[PDB]
Structure formats: C-alpha cells, structure tokens
C-alpha cells in the first residue's frame, strides 16, 4: 500500500526519527541532519489534508557505518524546537509479515 516505500527500500540503513514538531520538521531540517554524504530521505508521516506531521519520519542511508555514527551523533540534539529521538527502524513489509505469521508456529 506504500509504493514510495518500495522506491525508498534501496537504502538499507533506515532510521526512525521521532518527537518531531509539526512545523519544526522540514526538508531543510533533514538536509541539516544529512551529515553523511549518502543520499537521505526526508519523508515523514503527515495528515492527508492539513499536512500536520505526526512526529515520525524515516531517514534512509546506504552506509550502515554512517547509520551507526548518526545513531549517537544526533541523539537528543536537533536544530528545531522539539528534540530529536532516533530508533532502529523495525519497519516490515507485507511479505515479511506473512513470513513471520507462517513461522510463528515454531
């Protein structure tokens, strides 16, 4: 149900950014957070009509070393008002969900 996420699946090292202000989070904020040279992702979940972000975004990088570096590099420090939180993206696709359901037997 998320074709864009499939296009975003190219970069493996995906981090979940949380505690984002509705107006605080922006593309410029992601660019300022794009310390590593690898291509980032500024996509953040937001309201369909008003565009008010729920505070959760995902940043994808092709460098797991940059992932590890940024895990402790930008924990608690963010340019805007609301301080940033970083979590290991436990994101799953429908195929992974079906595989987990099948393997839940043992």
């Amino acid at each position: 149900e998320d074709p864009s996420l499939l296009e975003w699946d190219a970069d493996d090292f995906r981090i979940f950014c949380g505690d984002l202000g509705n107006e605080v989070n922006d593309d410029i904020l992601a660019r300022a957070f794009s310390r590593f040279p690898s291509f980032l992702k500024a996509k953040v979940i937001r309201d369909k009509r008003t565009g008010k972000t729920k505070g959760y975004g995902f940043v994808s990088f092709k460098d797991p070393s940059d992932y590890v570096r940024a895990m402790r590099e930008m924990n608690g420090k963010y340019v805007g008002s609301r301080p940033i939180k970083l979590r290991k993206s436990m994101w799953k696709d429908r195929n992974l969900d079906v595989v987990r359901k099948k393997q839940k037997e043992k």
């Binding site: 420090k77 008002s81 609301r82 301080p83």
Partner: protein, 141 residues
C-alpha cells in the same frame, strides 16, 4: 569581584541570548556597585564553575543597556531572568512575579537546584516550571 562576562552593549546581550543551544542563559540584570547585587554576583560566580556545562551566566548593566528595562519591567535590583532556549521561562517559587528572581539567594546549593530544575523544564519544552522550595516565606523564625 564581578569577573563574570558583562554585556557592554544592549544588542550584544540580545544576540548572546539568541546564540544559545541546549543551554540556559541566566541574564542577571542590575548594577555591580549595588551591595545586594554584589552578593548576587558573588553567588553566581560561585555557581558558575560547578554548572558551566549547561548554565551560562551573562551579566548586564541597566544604565549601559536601558532598552530592556521596560521590556520585562526591570525596576528592581538583583533581578534574574532565565531566558533559556529563546523563551522566557515561568519559574514559580511562591512569589507574585513568577518570571523574575530579584534578590540574592541565601545559599549557593539552592540556586544550583533552581537552575538545574530550570534546565530540565526548558529541555522538556514546557514554558513553566515550579520550584521545590517555595519562597512565599523567608523561614525567618
């Protein structure tokens, strides 16, 4: 002996307060030659070494910078405004004016506790925060 940094110009204090990141900017308004303000400056100097990591103290002179006297109603000695995160915090300590500490603290540890509580409140994002010790009474008895 009042060796803390002092704002020679009013606009310098403005940009100094603006140039803050994850720190609390304690701007102590008043005059160094006042005796109660001298005691407050001595207390701030004593605190400065212990809490310099997140608490920065930056004094200013009302005569040197009178433009901010009317901004926050600066008409008393020993006034302290915890202008942190570019937001004037609401520090409530059992007083009518819960945004200004206008008397020298009796003990340094009390001021350290107050400033760390202010830092916690500012980091949490709330614009108001209470004090563990109410100052409605001076505990004179």
């Amino acid at each position: 002996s009042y060796m803390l940094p002092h704002l020679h110009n009013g606009w310098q204090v403005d940009q100094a307060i603006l140039s803050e990141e994850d720190r609390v900017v304690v701007i102590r308004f008043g005059h160094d030659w006042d005796p109660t303000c001298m005691k407050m400056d001595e207390v701030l100097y004593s605190i400065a070494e212990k809490v310099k990591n997140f608490a920065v103290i930056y004094l200013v002179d009302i005569t040197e910078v009178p433009d901010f006297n009317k901004m926050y109603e600066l008409y008393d000695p020993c006034t302290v405004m915890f202008f942190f995160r570019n937001k004037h915090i609401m520090i409530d300590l059992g007083t009518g004016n819960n945004n200004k500490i206008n008397w020298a603290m009796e003990d340094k540890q009390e001021m350290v506790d107050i400033i760390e509580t202010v830092y916690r409140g500012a980091r949490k994002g709330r614009g108001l925060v209470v004090s563990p010790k109410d100052y409605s009474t001076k505990y004179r008895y």
